[PDB]
């Protein structure tokens, strides 16, 4: 079960994208958002976003969400369970800043429309999508 | 927009897996399930499953669900919206049966624990993510 | 069945597209990722759009033995493709294989003087299936 | 360029499979082999295999090979360049042993047909396969 967490945090860190849905917001649609973490494992999970993001208005002090995640080869599927709330902490913005994130804000770190969400993940259901090689066959083409 | 649907139905048909969550069931966890459709496009979307699946008990005449889907290289993400209900129709079982599905049932098509769900999808929000290859860099390895 | 195998291969190839293609004595034998295209749903030849200044071109002469390395996205299939590779910048073929994606690569469009087309005449491939089965789901404290 | 190596070693470590071809052996066919490394980065790269593997007979003191690698998900392609030779070192077998490797040998670590190859990689050409997320569009179906 330590293996599982490791695989998850690795997949998550490199593949990043989490589809994130909130009931009663936008018809419950799960939006693809790019996850970021400090370090190689362990949350919270951070998403850069925009102040006008509808999700923001409705999060209040924090809300229960289910994040849907798959690795980019579908060898791992995780249903992430945790609390989601805005936490646009300037210190955190500095830590998580990079040229990729930077491309999104006209105003840079100081963009008044910049927002940051944190997902405090307490558990995830994780499915491994494990494979077996077979004798390779020589075939005329 | 015709194109987006085509891309979607294609990814869905070959990649298959959809993560499917129901609130008030199992803490809202989205379970990976394998989608099947007749023909190359158009729903409904069918999932083989088990009678004891908790989701079943709670579907009643049908329920609103959001299916989360990505293609196998993440060049497409779809949030699928529709109604989900059991419809273990013997005719449908025959149409959708194959060796892969067969591996799951001790009893075959006749397994008393076999169940089939249909998702009647009315819309999906679809995000394209297409990759373009950067230029190759030589790199030394220690 | 060995007909199954070819079908899976041609399908993976058609949708996944990328083939890593190496030539000895060219560029240190490095296998470059190139995007394969075929007419129809199966069967070669396999076509790669490329550039006239591509070093590979200089060295192909009337045609050359190459090994193309291919995996499907998700890696459920690996194919080692064996065939002859040669330039065949046939205007008719360019028209048949043209699309907005290919178009994005040429400043001059179909008329770009630096446009080149390669054909790989594949006679056989060694093919390995790697199919994946989903394990029971585990819940982890996090 | 440090980023690139990191991504490579990570993809390699978790995805493992490298297609490995030798001229004048088996028509130059690149066989899918599962790479293993000690630690999270840095070679050599190890492949468990069999003594009767034709590749073995022809490696002598070592040979130049090109290993073709992609990540599942095709966000990274690496052409790996290095020297390949058998080095069935008992200490190394112990270090790299696991239930997955174990499933391949009737005789376990002691299987007389067990062989281990090491690829001493000096460089790789690496291509990143970079994506652009477009704006989501609702569609009818």
Domain ranges for chain A: 1-141
Quote the distance between the C-alpha of residue B140 and its chain's center.
Answer: 42
DSSP 8-state assignment for residue B60 = T
CA distance B112 to A4: 33
After which residues, if any, is chain C broken (C to N > 2.5 Å)? none
SS (H, E, C) chain D: CHHHHHHHHHHHHHHCEEEEECCCCHHHCCEEEEEECCCCCCCCEEEEEECCCHHHHCCCCCEEEEEEEECCCCCEEEEEEEEEEECCCHHHHHHHCCHHHHCCCCCHHHCCCEEEEEEEEEEEEEEEEEEEECCCEEECC
Least Cα distance to D26 among D81, D61, D77, D65 occurs for: D65
From chain A, pick out residues whose CB is under 8 angstroms from the CB of C136: 127
Q: Which long-range contacts (CB under 8 A, 24 or more apart) does D93-100 make?
A: D95/D38, D96/D36, D96/D38, D96/D46, D96/D48
CA distance A83 to A88: 15
Closest alpha carbon within chain C to B33:
C134
Resolution in A: 2.8
Enumerate residues 32 to 91 of chain D having a beta carbon within 8 A of any beta carbon in chain B. 42-43, 73-75, 77, 79-80, 82
Phi-psi sector, B24: left (phi>0), alpha (psi -120 to 50), beta = left
Closest alpha carbon within chain B to D140:
B123
The beta-carbon neighbor of A131 closest among C76, C124, C139 is: C76
Q: Domain C1-142 falls in which CATH fold? A: Pnp Oxidase; Chain A (2.30.110)
* Highest CATH level, class, for A1-141: mainly beta
Q: Using an 8 Å Cβ cutoff, are C71 and D16 in contact?
A: no
Q: Using an 8 Å Cβ cutoff, are B96 and B60 in contact?
A: no
DSSP 8-state assignment for residue A99 = H
Counting DSSP H helices and E strands in chain B, the numbers are 4, 7
| Preceding amide of D66 cis, omega within 30 | no
CA distance D79 to D96: 24
The beta-carbon neighbor of D21 closest among C16, C30, C67 is: C67
B-C contacts (CB, under 8 Å): 13
* Chains adjacent to A (≥3 CB pairs closer than 8 angstroms): B, C, D
Residue A21 CB coordination number (10 Å): 22
CA distance B98 to B105: 11
The beta-carbon neighbor of D72 closest among A31, A34, A73 is: A73
From chain A, pick out residues whose CB is under 8 angstroms from the CB of B17: 70, 74, 77
* Chains adjacent to D (≥3 CB pairs closer than 8 angstroms): A, B, C
Q: Give me the helix-helix angle, B2-15 and C2-16, nearest 10°.
A: 140
A103 touches chain C (CB under 8 A): no
């Amino acid at each position: 079960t330590k293996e599982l967490q490791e695989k998850f945090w690795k997949a998550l860190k490199s593949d990043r994208t989490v589809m994130l849905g909130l009931d009663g917001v936008e018809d419950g649609h799960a939006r693809p958002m790019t996850a970021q973490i400090e370090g190689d494992s362990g949350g919270p999970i951070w998403f850069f976003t925009s102040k006008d993001n509808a999700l923001i208005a409705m999060l209040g002090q924090g809300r229960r969400v289910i994040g849907a995640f798959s690795s980019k080869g579908h060898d791992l599927f995780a249903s992430i369970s945790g609390s989601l709330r805005e936490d646009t902490d300037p210190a955190m913005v500095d830590r998580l800043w990079n040229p990729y994130v930077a491309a999104w804000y006209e105003g840079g770190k100081t963009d008044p429309n910049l927002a940051l969400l944190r997902l405090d993940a307490d558990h995830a259901q994780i499915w491994l999508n494990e494979s077996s090689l077979l004798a390779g066959i020589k075939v005329l083409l």
